[PDB]
Structure formats: C-alpha cells, structure tokens
mitochondrial replication protein MTF1 (Saccharomyces cerevisiae), 322 residues
Amino acid sequence: PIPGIKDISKLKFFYGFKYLWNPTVYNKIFDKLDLTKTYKHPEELKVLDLYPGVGIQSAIFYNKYCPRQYSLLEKRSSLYKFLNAKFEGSPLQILKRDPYDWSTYSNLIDEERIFVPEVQSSDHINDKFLTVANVTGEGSEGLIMQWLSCIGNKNWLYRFGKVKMLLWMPSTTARKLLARPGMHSRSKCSVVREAFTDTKLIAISDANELKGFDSQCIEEWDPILFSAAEIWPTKGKPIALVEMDPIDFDFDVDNWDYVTRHLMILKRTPLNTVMDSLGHGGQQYFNSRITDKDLLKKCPIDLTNDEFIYLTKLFMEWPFKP
Ligand SMILES: [Xe]
Ligand SMILES: [Xe]
Ligand SMILES: [Xe]
C-alpha cells in the first residue's frame, strides 16, 4: 500500500501542468469509470502513466487495483525527485524520460523490454494494457493532434490494439476535441476524434465550462464536477478528464486526411465554393457528383465525419488526376 500525497505537493513548479489532489474526487471518478468492467483481471493488468506529476492518482489507482505493473514516466527533475522519494520502496516503477518523445517508447518497450504490453485483436478494447496521461501543460492541443494520428495509423502505443486511455487536459482543449458539428469549437481534431474514437467527458473542474459542450452529451456523460480548489497549481485554467477509446474504421486515412485538412482550414466557407481547395477545377468537378445540394449550402464546420468520408470517396474517383 502506497502513501497518498497531500499538501506536501505544495512545493514545486510543474511547467503549466495542473493536478487534482483531492482523493475524494478520484474515488468518485474511479467509481464512475468502473474499469474492472473491462479489466477483469487487475493482477494481470499493466499500466503506463505519462507525466504522473504528484502521483496522487497513481497511488490511489494502485492501492485500489494492484496492477501487474504500473510505470510512471516523469521528465521534470524536481517532480521526478519528489516522486522518487515519496514512493521509495513502492511497487511503482519510476523512470525519468520524456513521455512525449517517440524514442522513449522505442527504447523502453522494444530495445530494453522494460515495459512491454500484451498486443491484442483490435475487435475489443485491449484488456491488459491501460494508459493514463496528463496533458494540462503547454501545447496540449498539438500533442493531442499527434496522439490522434497514432490511432489512425496504429502507431505508438496503439500497435497493441484498441487501448483505453484516460487523459487530463485544459477544458478549452477538451471543448474543441469533443465539439459536435455546427458548434463554434468544431475543428479538425473534433472530426478526427469523431472518426477514430469514442471519447467521454468524465470530469471537469468548472461547472461554467459545461456550456461549451453539447447539452445532449453532457446529459449522457454526466461528468463529475469539482472545484479549482481541488486542483493544486492554482490560478490556472480549468482542466478536464476524458476517457478515450479507439474504434474500428474502414476508409482511406491518407485521402481522408488530405480532404479534411483542406476543408477544415476553411471550415466556415460554404461547400459550394470551398471545393477548389482540393485542386484546380475542384468546385466544378464536385458540383457534378454532389446531388443532395442541401449539404452544398453547408460548411465543413457543419459536416459529420461520414459526410467527410463521402467527400473523400468522390475525391479519389476524381478523373484525370495524375
Ligand atoms: Xe483496473
Ligand atoms: Xe514505455
Ligand atoms: Xe483517472
């Protein structure tokens, strides 16, 4: 049994990261997640913790599930040193490495065999591999775009199957990510998240932030609310917990990416004028394939992913395109 960390944590920098420190909340969250509904053999489970920070979540999770292996990747020296002292002698494996560098995994998993998960058939969420990560710091919006890309190509940690992942991140980032068609928050990442995953909002630190999300989704989600006080590094923006589960898809990622990339950079432009961005003569080509027309008056910001799939299908069938 590992020691729960309290306001000892009231002593570091964090580089823009924020952490929930109130154990009461984590319990509500873990009760809400009901992880063992999928991980029925926790003794067998292996967990990867990216940017643990204060290891409060790590100590609580471990204390509740005793996984086969819980590994924490902390790059920040002060925090690394902190965790190193607190959990000294614990079952937790604490390594100081950049969690957001491809080289780290190539070496810890492949080369050194320090942490190697069980690969499984992507017909169901991997049930022996779980990954948790804090992305509350700077550039979370970019890190997430990259993260998504790996689901699409099955790179990185996704080469092990459909692995569940719980991520903390600024609520503003969570609002773009979970944004639905038509919303102002709609961006390329919402479309990608829609296309490759089933993500649920599990917790948020500001009841005021819920208005940015879909009222209907907030319904189905019913996310645990908590305050700014339960977040250590104070005076920071509100954070949000998301459960990200990859899903199966059957379309051409390469072309789809090309099309969505172009259309979404002009997401506010009507579909009856934006097509020439795909290539010279694009509008005239597309106006001859698209019959519906009710969607010709829309904008990319209004389209669903299925509509995008349809649009890239037309793209590939574009004749005389060397
Ligand atoms: Xe678990
Ligand atoms: Xe790793
Ligand atoms: Xe969590």
